[PDB]
Amino acid sequence: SVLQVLHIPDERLRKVAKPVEEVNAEIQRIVDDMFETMYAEEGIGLAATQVDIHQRIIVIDVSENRDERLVLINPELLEKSGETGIEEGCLSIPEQRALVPRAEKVKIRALDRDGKPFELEADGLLAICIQHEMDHLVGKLFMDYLSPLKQQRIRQKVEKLDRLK
Ligand code: NI
């Protein structure tokens, strides 16, 4: 099923997700629902916190043909290097983009949808998306890196959009 994506101001977006206990059928259904939601919202990443599920689960797909499913369950940053940034969007912050500092490369470990551990070295867009999604699981948003005024501006714009929807 396609799930409801929370938007700021929503305080739930500020929650810190708990680690996943076992990767069972129930976890796998959450993963599958999260992909469905992500794809439907035309997104490249989604964290469980965004759909009010506070467990360390991320889904990502940075491909055009939407057939490269990356699942990060209980992800762990093992190393990062360099610096970069692009103008990032966020399904929890509709229609607002801003450039945000990020590591250029990350190396992470996580469990996949079967519960298998794997390591992944990423760079470019995928590194940035991974960092953005991992920020979600500790209640952090791309807005947090901007000036207090810019946070208020953005948060004002979002509240106006949800009034009209
Ligand atoms: Ni986001």
Q: For 1-165, which CATH superfamily applies?
A: Peptide deformylase (3.90.45.10)
Task: Supply 132's token pair.
Answer: 């953005």
Beta-bridge partner residues of 58: 47, 72
Domain ranges in the chain are 1-165
Q: How many CA atoms lie within 13 A of 149 on its CB side?
A: 0
Report the separation in Å between the CA atom of 7 and the middle of ligand 1, taken as the mean of its atom positions: 10
Report the separation in Å between the CA atom of 23 and the middle of ligand 1, taken as the mean of its atom positions: 23
* HEC letters along 25-62: HHHHHHHHHHHHHHHHCCCCEEEHHHHCCCECEEEECC
Q: Which residues are catalytic?
A: 133
Cβ atoms 141, 8 nearer than 8 A = yes
Report the separation in Å between the CA atom of 27 and the middle of ligand 1, taken as the mean of its atom positions: 21
Q: Which residues contact 124 (CB under 8 A, 6 or more apart)?
A: none
Instruction: Name the 3-class secondary structure at 84.
Output: strand
Task: Supply 81's token pair.
Answer: 């290097």
| Structure-solving method | X-ray
Neighbours of ion ligand 1 (CB under 5 A): 90
